[PDB]
């Protein structure tokens, strides 16, 4: 858990302008969070990038998990292998408000982080999931009680998130 160059926002939330994949390779954290969907199909965005960094091992493991257990619910999670990226991957399904899912489920999604002492994570439901990224950061700060290191791969968004928190 050798995180470097993060800005501490609260006693348990840290943030950096960085690619989560590159952070996971450098830090080798105990847990890396994936911004998953309910069938664990890692077809693009953060999930596709994490799966590609495992050379598709994450997708094969995910298909086997779904075969035995069925899909997740929106706001839910599962713990699978971290492969070369972490000891464990916490696959968390935030709501996709561009597809009509309820933004209130973003609190349930962040509540999954509280079962793990230290996590490397992306900003849930942001990007093409359509949630307001400043609201996602507020829900993270208000909900997560364990130690979370957020990697946000966009300097323009990073700067707007830090400015909004420090208001
Ligand atoms: C808001 C943006 C900046 C953020 N992106 C990222 N945040 C952190 N590490 C990242 N690595 C890459 C990457 C690495 N290689 N490739 C080709 C992509 C993206 C990226 C983000 C945050 C949450 C979500 C998404 C995107 S999403 O659009 O994938 C939908 C799921 C929720």
Q: What's the per-residue H, E or C state across the chain?
A: CCCCCCEECCCCEEEEECCHHHHHHHHCCCEEEEECCCCCCCCCHHHHHHHHHCCCHHHHHHHHHHHHHCCCCCCCEEEEECCCCCCEEEEECCCCHHHCCCCCHHHHHHHHHHHCCEEEECCCCCHHHCCCHHHHHHHHHHHCCCEEEEEECCHHHHHHHHHHHCC
46 CA distance to ligand 1 centroid (A)? 4
> Residue 129 sits in which domain range?
1-165
* CATH number of the domain enclosing 134: 3.40.220.10
Structure obtained using: X-ray
Q: How far is the CA of 127 from the centre of ligand 1 (A)?
A: 7
Distance CA 3, CA 59 (A): 26
List b or e across 139-167, with b for residues whose CB sees 16 or more CB atoms inside 10 angstroms: bbbebbeebbbbbbbbeebbeebeeebee
Decide: 126 in ligand 1 pocket, CB within 6 A: yes
Picking from 37, 28, 133, the residue whose alpha carbon sits closest to that of residue 82 is 28
Closest C-alpha to 4, from 55, 38, 77, 22: 22
What's the token pair of residue 81?
A: 């292998």
152 lines ligand 1 (CB under 6 A): yes
Structural domains counted in the chain: 1
Q: Euclidean distance between the first and final Cα of the chain, in Å?
A: 30
In sequence order, the β-bridge partners of residue 45 are none
| Entry resolution (Å) | 1.2
């Amino acid at each position: 858990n050798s995180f470097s160059g993060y800005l501490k926002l609260t006693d348990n939330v840290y943030i950096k302008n960085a690619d989560i994949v590159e952070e996971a390779k450098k830090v080798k954290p105990t847990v890396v969070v994936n911004a998953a969907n309910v069938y664990l199909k890692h077809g693009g965005g953060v999930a596709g990038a994490l799966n590609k960094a495992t050379n598709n091992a994450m997708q094969v493991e995910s298909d086997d998990y779904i075969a035995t257990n069925g899909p997740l619910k929106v706001g839910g999670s599962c713990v699978l292998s971290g492969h070369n990226l972490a000891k464990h991957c916490l696959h968390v399904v935030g709501p996709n408000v561009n597809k009509g899912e309820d933004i209130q489920l973003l609190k349930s999604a962040y509540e999954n982080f509280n079962q793990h002492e230290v996590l490397l994570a992306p900003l849930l439901s942001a990007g093409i999931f359509g949630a307001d990224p400043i609201h996602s950061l507020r829900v993270c700060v208000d909900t997560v009680r364990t130690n979370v290191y957020l990697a946000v791969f966009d300097k323009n968004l990073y700067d707007k998130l830090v400015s909004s928190f420090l208001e």
